[PDB]
Design a protein around this motif. Sequence first.
Motif, mmCIF file in Angstrom:
data_model
loop_
_atom_site.group_PDB
_atom_site.id
_atom_site.type_symbol
_atom_site.label_atom_id
_atom_site.label_comp_id
_atom_site.label_asym_id
_atom_site.label_seq_id
_atom_site.Cartn_x
_atom_site.Cartn_y
_atom_site.Cartn_z
ATOM 1 N N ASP A 9 0.823 -1.210 0.000
ATOM 2 C CA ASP A 9 0.000 0.000 0.000
ATOM 3 C C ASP A 9 0.857 1.260 0.000
ATOM 4 O OD1 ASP A 9 -1.815 -2.050 0.337
ATOM 5 O OD2 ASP A 9 -3.124 -0.877 1.651
ATOM 6 N N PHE A 10 2.166 1.059 0.083
ATOM 7 C CA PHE A 10 3.136 2.134 0.238
ATOM 8 C C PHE A 10 3.804 2.295 -1.123
ATOM 9 C CE2 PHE A 10 6.355 4.485 2.819
ATOM 10 C CZ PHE A 10 7.371 4.555 1.888
ATOM 11 N N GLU A 11 3.881 3.526 -1.618
ATOM 12 C CA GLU A 11 4.357 3.732 -2.980
ATOM 13 C C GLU A 11 5.864 3.581 -3.089
ATOM 14 O OE1 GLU A 11 2.706 7.567 -2.711
ATOM 15 O OE2 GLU A 11 1.349 7.316 -4.415
ATOM 16 N N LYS A 12 6.280 2.825 -4.096
ATOM 17 C CA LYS A 12 7.665 2.799 -4.532
ATOM 18 C C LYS A 12 7.949 4.123 -5.227
ATOM 19 C CE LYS A 12 7.113 -2.152 -5.180
ATOM 20 N NZ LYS A 12 7.406 -3.334 -6.038
ATOM 21 N N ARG A 13 9.039 4.791 -4.861
ATOM 22 C CA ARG A 13 9.233 6.167 -5.311
ATOM 23 C C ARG A 13 10.690 6.570 -5.509
ATOM 24 N NH1 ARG A 13 5.705 8.809 -0.596
ATOM 25 N NH2 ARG A 13 5.972 6.687 0.222
ATOM 26 N N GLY A 14 10.895 7.430 -6.501
ATOM 27 C CA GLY A 14 12.130 8.169 -6.678
ATOM 28 C C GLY A 14 11.911 9.633 -6.348
ATOM 29 N N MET A 15 13.002 10.357 -6.097
ATOM 30 C CA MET A 15 12.964 11.790 -5.796
ATOM 31 C C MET A 15 11.942 12.147 -4.721
ATOM 32 S SD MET A 15 15.392 12.828 -7.674
ATOM 33 C CE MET A 15 15.314 14.615 -7.545
ATOM 34 N N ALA A 16 11.811 11.281 -3.723
ATOM 35 C CA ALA A 16 10.913 11.534 -2.606
ATOM 36 C C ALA A 16 11.587 12.399 -1.554
ATOM 37 C CB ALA A 16 10.441 10.221 -1.991
ATOM 38 N N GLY A 17 10.779 13.071 -0.744
ATOM 39 C CA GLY A 17 11.284 13.695 0.459
ATOM 40 C C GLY A 17 11.682 12.611 1.442
ATOM 41 N N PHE A 18 12.846 12.767 2.060
ATOM 42 C CA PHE A 18 13.323 11.793 3.033
ATOM 43 C C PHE A 18 14.174 12.499 4.078
ATOM 44 C CE2 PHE A 18 16.235 7.963 3.833
ATOM 45 C CZ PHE A 18 15.386 7.456 4.800
ATOM 46 N N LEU A 19 13.723 12.456 5.328
ATOM 47 C CA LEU A 19 14.383 13.191 6.403
ATOM 48 C C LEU A 19 14.260 12.514 7.760
ATOM 49 C CD1 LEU A 19 12.976 16.783 5.643
ATOM 50 C CD2 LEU A 19 15.314 16.070 5.196
ATOM 51 N N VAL A 20 15.250 12.722 8.621
ATOM 52 C CA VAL A 20 15.059 12.430 10.031
ATOM 53 C C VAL A 20 14.507 13.685 10.694
ATOM 54 C CG1 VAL A 20 16.142 11.848 12.221
ATOM 55 C CG2 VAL A 20 16.894 10.716 10.124
ATOM 56 N N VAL A 21 13.371 13.552 11.368
ATOM 57 C CA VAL A 21 12.760 14.680 12.057
ATOM 58 C C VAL A 21 12.425 14.256 13.477
ATOM 59 C CG1 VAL A 21 10.963 16.436 12.023
ATOM 60 C CG2 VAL A 21 11.753 15.437 9.873
ATOM 61 N N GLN A 22 13.010 14.945 14.458
ATOM 62 C CA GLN A 22 12.779 14.662 15.875
ATOM 63 C C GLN A 22 12.746 13.159 16.179
ATOM 64 O OE1 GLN A 22 9.252 17.189 16.708
ATOM 65 N NE2 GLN A 22 10.676 18.703 17.554
ATOM 66 N N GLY A 23 13.766 12.452 15.695
ATOM 67 C CA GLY A 23 13.942 11.044 16.007
ATOM 68 C C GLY A 23 13.233 10.039 15.114
#
Lengths: 345, 345
Positions: B177-191
């Motif tokens: 149900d989770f999209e396979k993706r390129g050029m996605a936002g990806f970050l560590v935020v508050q742990g």
Amino acid sequence: TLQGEWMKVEQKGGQVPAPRSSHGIAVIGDKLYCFGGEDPPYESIDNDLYVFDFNTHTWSIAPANGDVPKTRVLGTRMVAVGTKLYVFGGRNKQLEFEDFYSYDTVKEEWKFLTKLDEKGGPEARTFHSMTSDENHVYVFGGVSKGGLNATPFRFRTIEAYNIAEGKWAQLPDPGEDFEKRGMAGFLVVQGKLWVFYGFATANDPKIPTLYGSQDYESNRVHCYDPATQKWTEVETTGFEKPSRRSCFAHAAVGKYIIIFGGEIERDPEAHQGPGTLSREGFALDTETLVWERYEGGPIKPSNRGWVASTTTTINGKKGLLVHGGKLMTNERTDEMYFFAVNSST
Amino acid sequence: TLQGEWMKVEQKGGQVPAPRSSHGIAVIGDKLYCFGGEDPPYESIDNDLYVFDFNTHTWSIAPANGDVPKTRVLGTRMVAVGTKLYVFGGRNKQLEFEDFYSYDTVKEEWKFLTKLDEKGGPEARTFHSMTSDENHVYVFGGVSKGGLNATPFRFRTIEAYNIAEGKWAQLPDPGEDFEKRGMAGFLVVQGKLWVFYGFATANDPKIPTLYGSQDYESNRVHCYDPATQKWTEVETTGFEKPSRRSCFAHAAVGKYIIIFGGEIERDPEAHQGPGTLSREGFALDTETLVWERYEGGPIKPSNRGWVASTTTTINGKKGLLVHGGKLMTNERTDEMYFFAVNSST
């Protein structure tokens, strides 16, 4: 469901109109008519009535007889009913607005119909939208303006001209919950008037400013039924429901409202730059209330908005005709495109 | 709510890098590091490690010592942990993929860490996204080319490199149900690890094709908690929730995920043309789950995507650093912008 083909309309030559945005077009028979326009930004161009013959693929200028329009305007619009054209509003840099004129395409002469901006009569408007039916010309929205440093405003009303009576009346006001808008979609679809998307004045002080203004792109849809004189807001759906936008091409074909292009992000300097323009086409099925993208084969018109558009039939196919506009280069274009619908509507 | 200022970082000179998109940047101390890139479309550029000093506002080239990356790649990425840079993936026009490398900014040497695409190890990826924390480098998504006439697919998995142990492991797969993706936002935020938006492979044959492909812009947001090893999908809100998009600048500042620009409409020819690019900035409060636009004063970066971006601190202000990318002219840019957050986050 809605299938079709994009075509670039060949223009062989003649008295070709300079590239323009913010202008009006309409077709009667095998002829395209073109009036008004903007280029460079905030500047009008001319007041000739250009005529494109679809059989010869050439341009000409219609005879300037009768009550010739007094102003070269941008933000003007034009519709066709029968063998007459109707021009309403728009303005020049000096804030002179075009009044309401008809052009009889048979006798090739202009007639002055209504002085605009008088008390109790239809107001001067620019960047309004227009549509029509068998016995009416309809004007929705657009922006008023007093003087140079005035705070101009938008309309949420429709002015309706009864052709048979030669009389204007304002239709019922949809009220405060309905966004006042310029460059909105406005069409007659299967006997009802539809207002959709466009560039809105906010009716909520909580909406934050962008570039110093709260103004934003609408994605709301309303329909007005002349049979009841009642307004309804329409909830439209679909994975491919288009993002908020304004100044797009639009036309009605059967149950479909068909759109292309448009401003999807504001320019920091109002109409000075091109903002962000779409290169995508969407259609709304007014029966299922579902939005879908459409595609039209190898010809893919580039990003544009502030085009002129109308409904016509070319080579036996109804569809959406697109002329002029501004490009993401911020240049105006003279290009003309037609999306020919193949499937049932 | 999120208040701040856009700045154009002046670049005085030195060994300044050619304009590029689809590359990686990261900051350590007072130095920006830059590697990889695309220009012209589908063409890589170089394999130098460029270094920008924020005190001198000048560029230099880092010593190419140690295990210098063997390929000039586009779609590569780089993050910083401590005094080391980490480069993962990307490819050249010939489908040679970059492996996993570190650069010691102190000793000024490359070290080869992991051969990619081996059994039981991290896969070769390009146009993936990266982030990091105290003891991990994280890689999400992107596209794997098989052979020349191969079809390619996207990843929905995260590979996590434990720096102290020198070992890769894949995090729990979020499922179909989770999209396979390129050029996605990806970050560590508050742990927590956040994955948001991006350019998705469809998991529904009912999604129609555009330009011959079902691929589309995502607007979905997920977060993974290492403490629980759980994925959760996050419902985000707001009048100013950004439309679906990919390839945007993005950074984390406190509770905020801050983004700018990005592809909002596909190009008809994949990466050949520029498609439609946004000139707008949005931020997500990960506590309220509300999106809002942000503005930064008179400096307004023009439409762009495929930029390199990261989080850093400049002149005592945390913020979003934006470098390179492609413009709506389809040209690459060498411009660098910084959105300096002024309020606490």
